[model samples]
Target: QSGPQQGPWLREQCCNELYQEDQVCVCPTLKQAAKSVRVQGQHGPFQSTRIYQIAKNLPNVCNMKQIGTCPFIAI
Candidate 1:
């Protein structure tokens, strides 16, 4: 079965998870932000979500515009 966890295009452990450079598999990063939301629900300024900020910046840093953020990445 097809799945994100394993793919030849995926590389680098950015955002604390392996991801394809081109597609930029933002899954792990998004999950982390979502977790941050819950942790706050469970600091101030939504402080723990800095990773999300960094993740969003990656596309530009890597020299590509996001065609569309991965499925659930809406703020």
Candidate 2:
């Protein structure tokens, strides 16, 4: 697979309605998007290496936190 295409690729792959509020690279469709893109980096049934890589690289790509959680969820 080609290197992860940054920028609006996330938005392009998913939907215009899925855009986060200028926040962390948080996308409800994140798991689905990566599965469809079929890139080679990290591998998982529901996630990929590049996906995880991107999370760690968030500070470089954008000034947002890597991951966020729903306040309603319990641990």
Candidate 3:
């Protein structure tokens, strides 16, 4: 979250904890996350920690909520 070249851009990327174990598909390396989401493409279920970083830098307003399990979204 702090660099001219950071996250996936530096090299090997990082993913959120949810995918760290058995949910690998939802998490691609950060390199993959930075492709600038396309039209109806395979993007994310991104890593939450990094999402927070990028989202923090941007000016848009978002309402992130968390609840329950499997469908239990947390960031």
Candidate 4:
């Protein structure tokens, strides 16, 4: 949500591509977002904890709901 280049852009570029296809296609999207995180926090080695915030948010952000949307379960 904070950047000179950020999620909105990915929403236009990668996000929609995934959203139109939705989670199954977007499941792999973690890879893409992961890279952007690399690009975003790509400053140096980043936080894996920070990574999940996006994965967890990917559902809410992409307009998908929790538990039902994604395949993997956490706790």
True-structure lDDT of candidate 2:
0.36
lDDT of 2 by residue, 1-75 (tens): 379765554522222323335333344334445444445444334335445335332222223343431111011
Per-residue CA lDDT of model 3 for 1-75, tens digit only, reads: 555573232211222343334444332322243434421256546654455334321111111112111112222
lDDT of 4: 0.46
- The 10 consecutive residues of candidate 2 with the worst lDDT sum are 66-75
- TM-score, structure 2 vs. true: 0.27
Ranking by TM-score: 4, 2, 1, 3
TM-score of 4: 0.37
Q: Name the top TM-score candidate.
A: 4
After best superposition, candidate 2 residue 71: deviation in angstroms? 22
For model 3, give the RMSD to the true fold: 14.5
Give the alpha carbon lDDT tens digit for every residue of 1-75 in model 4.
445573343433434655667456555546444555555443676654455344544444455554222222222
lDDT of each: 0.40, 0.36, 0.30, 0.46
**In candidate 1, what are the lDDT values of residues 11-74, reduced to their tens digit?**
2233233334434555444555456453553433453445444344234322223432221233
What's the TM-score of each model vs. the native? Answer: 0.27, 0.27, 0.18, 0.37
- Which residue pairs of candidate 2 clash? 42-49
Between prediction 3 and prediction 4, which has the larger lDDT? 4
**Which of candidates 1 and 2 is the stronger one according to TM-score?**
2
